[PDB]
Design a protein around this nucleic acid. Structure first.
Lengths: 104, 259, 70, 66, 88, 117
RNA sequence: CUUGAGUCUCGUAGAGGGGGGUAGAAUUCCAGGUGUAGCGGUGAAAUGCGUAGAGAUCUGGAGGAAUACCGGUGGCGAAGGCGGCCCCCUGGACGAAGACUGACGCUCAGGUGCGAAAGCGUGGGGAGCAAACAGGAUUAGAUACCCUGGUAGUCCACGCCGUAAACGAUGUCGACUUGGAGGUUGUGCCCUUGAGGCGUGGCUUCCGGAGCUAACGCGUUAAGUCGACCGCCUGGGGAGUAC
């Protein structure tokens, strides 16, 4: 429908919970016949500045071709979920399946 | 008729833009201005200093032929950029010749490293090379008789920015500038750079593969303020300069000359 | 303009470096600019005026240069 | 002497942090298109990318802040 | 704007050839649909003045088209206005 | 008083008056001095010399703490900026870092109106 | 009938508009730590804040407003105007080829809408700034300029107001007439042999030719050469006032 690109940052103490969260997110996307073109756990990462007093955080990239309702839902979930510190759902023109420059 | 049209495409065919075709005949000499005519719209105001060879006196009388250069047209009145750069292409060709047989042989004599590689001079010109290139091993030409005769065996060349370090003695043995701007960095790496334009606060020596250096007015000499850089150095000349400072961000490498 | 004195570096040199850094930043200039409120109009005017001046310097002066002074 | 014209990139990436880092100051500020010689079209894109990065704490807003 | 598929559909219905697209009637239909779409938007966003300008322009264009149709060929116009449900 | 080897010098350099404050690395102020305090008033205290002497005074004040290493944080625009740090150096601390810490907003609050003189 | 006008296809750049989120810097205040006599301010002072612990400095919190750098005689918009980042809804512009419609056009008195800032109404909000006001200076006086404070207001919602040097002091639309140097945004070809080479469109900054102009100047974005429609002027004041 519309090709979004999502990057969310999880609190580093909840790093072991991340995979489950990712799975959940994927599931929702799948539900509305939404494809998920790339998905990249960047892992624990040093922040350029300390958001909410903490210096590292766990970054997950995820590209999705989904309807906007589901995106909205995801956003809502993120906002209420306290594990995820920041998110940045961000539209894109194409599917962009090729890997990110920091993974490579 | 189409005589002229054909003559035009003929004359297009029998010239090119760079200093390649040795065509300008020296048709008046006067100190301090040479002048040619390479089939261009006007005659060059040549310096005398693009034409004296290795000890200071002139070499070419009337009728003699050197190509100059091009791709710059009309600053008001006149035609060229200097033929001496011409010469650089010839030097490049000889350096390239190495590749064929994996060994360019001339003479290289390198006494010392301004910036970590002995300086080698070929014919009139002198070039700077990275520190390893001067010696094959750890021999070091400091114990060799000063300004000794070998050749140059090439150690390293930078391929974009022109720095070539060559192999003295041991005959038997045989986007782009700004990401990795850490090569000439570390505090004081001396460089050989041609100055371009002196902006009454500066001199703008800039050679190392698409960068910009200043050497502004404060150093330049050992007088501060009364100096006026046009009096004190040159126009278009390869000099002693080193970095003293790099900002890889606001591309201002601030070189010096008082060293 | 965060700076650290290198091992066996002179004080004066360090100071100079710091100064240079500051200059690069344009921190002082920025401060000066934000001392008082500039009306948008005024800001616009300065920018355009400055531009005009620059243009004048570049072209008219170049034209003058073509002709010799003596 | 623009990099992005030569590379021929379709869009500048905020994730490509290293690349961004060449166009950002020691103090964190985005470097002018006069200095870098970046093309105007690309410059804006680059700026946007940088901004995005800053939001994601990939690049810093400034040197001092902590 | 109007989605491509929707536009195509509109063209097919009103246009005689279906490749035609520029038929007056077809154009009118296209305009009308757009107007309808924008009504919803403008109910929500009453202060979106700039956008509303475009809508107004579109409406004007439609009116003009209708007028043109009327002088040329009355029956067709009548048919069109029955189809779309344009009071005039 | 507990002696401390390393600390910070905060140099608040205004247009009218320089204030030097030596503190520990954590934030807790040890001593301070000012150009206004050093026996300079009006025209005099808005000068580099004044700033320097303030700095000197400050240094003198934190003698008992036994401070060898010192990082400098320079704030605001003023004469007392280079001079002050020089003075500090003279007074004989190993100057470790020289930081600028001027508060630059990213366009935030409206400044006061421009003076008509 | 297809050259004007419009529709469709694919892209393009954009501070165009409306709505909802969020980020970081800085100011202010609150609470607490450290610390000690000044701070602040000016031409110079004083009012003012300070030993009831200010200023400085560090930690934590609150809240509002605006968005450094990018940033540009850059961009978009009918004008007014529009500037962090993200999403949702949404208007226009331009190019590339085709395909279609077939004069459907231009202008517009009345009419209708949009229309900076200030201002008004009701309800919120209120950090900073600041008409009014107060004090301190300056001064012959100082109902000002400068300083210290400071309330409407600025901010948001929904209404009204309908004006500005609302300016390019230049109505809109179309056609035609020598050039140069740029900027920006497409696009065709070319060995992109490289940041290039040769074109071709849109918008745009400066200089200047003919011509025009009282001169200043304008000059393919005309103030030139013409056509279509509208608006407006008829000495200065009285007056854009009175009724």
């Amino acid at each position: 429908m519309r090709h979004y690109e999502i990057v969310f940052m999880v609190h580093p103490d909840q790093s072991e919970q991340v995979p489950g969260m990712i799975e959940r997110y994927t599931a929702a996307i799948t539900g509305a016949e939404g494809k998920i073109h790339r998905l990249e756990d960047w892992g624990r990462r040093q922040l350029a500045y300390p958001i909410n007093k903490l210096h590292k955080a766990h970054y997950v990239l995820m590209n999705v071709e989904a309807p906007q309702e589901v995106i909205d839902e995801l956003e809502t979930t993120f906002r209420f979920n306290d594990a995820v510190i920041r998110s940045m759902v961000m539209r894109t023109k194409h599917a962009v399946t090729e890997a990110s420059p920091m993974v490579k | 008729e189409s005589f002229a049209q054909l003559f035009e495409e003929s004359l297009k065919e029998i010239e090119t833009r760079p200093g390649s075709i040795v065509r300008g005949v020296v048709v008046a000499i006067d100190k301090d201005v040479v002048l040619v005519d390479a089939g261009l719209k006007s005659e060059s105001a040549i310096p005398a200093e693009q034409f004296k060879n290795a000890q200071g006196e002139l070499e070419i009388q009337v009728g003699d032929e050197v190509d100059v250069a091009l791709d710059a047209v009309e600053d008001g009145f006149g035609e060229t950029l200097l033929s001496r750069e011409k010469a650089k292409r010839h030097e490049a060709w000889i350096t390239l010749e190495k590749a064929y047989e994996d060994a360019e042989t001339v003479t290289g004599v390198i006494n010392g490293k301004v910036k970590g590689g002995f300086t080698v001079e070929l014919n009139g010109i002198r070039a700077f090379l990275p520190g390893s290139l001067v010696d094959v091993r750890p021999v070091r030409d400091t114990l060799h008789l000063e300004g000794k005769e070998l050749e140059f065996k090439v150690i390293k060349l930078d391929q974009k920015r022109n720095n070539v370090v060559v192999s003295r003695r041991a005959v038997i043995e045989s986007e782009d500038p700004w990401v990795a701007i850490a090569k000439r960095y570390p505090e004081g790496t001396k460089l050989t750079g041609r100055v371009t334009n002196l902006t009454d606060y500066g001199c703008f020596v800039e050679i190392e593969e698409g960068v910009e250096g200043l050497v502004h007015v404060s150093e330049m000499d050992w007088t501060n303020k009364n100096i006026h850089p046009s009096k004190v150095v040159n126009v278009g000349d390869v000099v002693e300069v080193m970095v003293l400072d790099i900002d890889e961000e606001r591309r201002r490498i601030s070189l010096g000359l008082k060293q | 303009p965060v700076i650290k004195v290198r091992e066996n570096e002179p004080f004066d040199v360090a100071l100079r470096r710091f100064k240079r850094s500051c200059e690069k930043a344009g921190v002082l200039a920025e401060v000066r600019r934000r001392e008082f409120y500039e009306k948008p109009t005024t800001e616009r005017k300065r920018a355009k005026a400055s531009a005009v001046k620059r243009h004048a310097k570049k072209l008219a002066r170049e034209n003058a240069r073509r002709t010799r002074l003596y | 002497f623009c990099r992005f014209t030569a590379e021929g990139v379709q869009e500048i990436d905020y994730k490509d942090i290293a690349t961004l880092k060449n166009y950002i100051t020691e103090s964190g500020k985005i470097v002018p298109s006069r200095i870098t010689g970046t093309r105007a079209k690309y410059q804006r894109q680059l700026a946007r990318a940088i901004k995005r990065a800053r939001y994601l704490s990939l690049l810093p807003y400034t040197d001092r802040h902590q | 704007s109007l989605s491509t598929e929707a536009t195509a559909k509109i063209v097919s219905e009103f246009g005689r050839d279906a490749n035609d697209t520029g038929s007056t009637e077809v154009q009118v239909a296209l305009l009308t649909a757009q107007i309808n779409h924008l009504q919803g938007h403008f109910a929500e966003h009453k202060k979106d003045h700039h956008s509303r300008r475009g809508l107004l322009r579109m409406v004007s264009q439609r009116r003009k088209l209708l007028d043109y149709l009327k002088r040329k060929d009355v029956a067709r116009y009548t048919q069109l206005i029955e189809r779309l449900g344009l009071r005039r | 008083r507990k002696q401390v080897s390393d600390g910070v010098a905060h140099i608040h350099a205004s247009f009218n008056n320089t204030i030097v404050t030596i503190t520990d690395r954590q934030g807790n102020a040890l001593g301070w001095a000012t150009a206004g305090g050093s026996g300079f008033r009006g025209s005099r205290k808005s000068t580099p010399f004044a700033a320097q002497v303030a700095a000197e005074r400050c240094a003198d004040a934190v003698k008992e703490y036994g401070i060898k290493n010192l990082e400098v944080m320079v704030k605001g625009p003023g004469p007392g900026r280079e001079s002050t740090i020089r003075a500090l150096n003279a007074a004989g601390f190993r100057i470790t870092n020289i930081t600028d810490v001027t508060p630059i907003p990213h366009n935030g609050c409206r400044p006061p109106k421009k003076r008509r003189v």
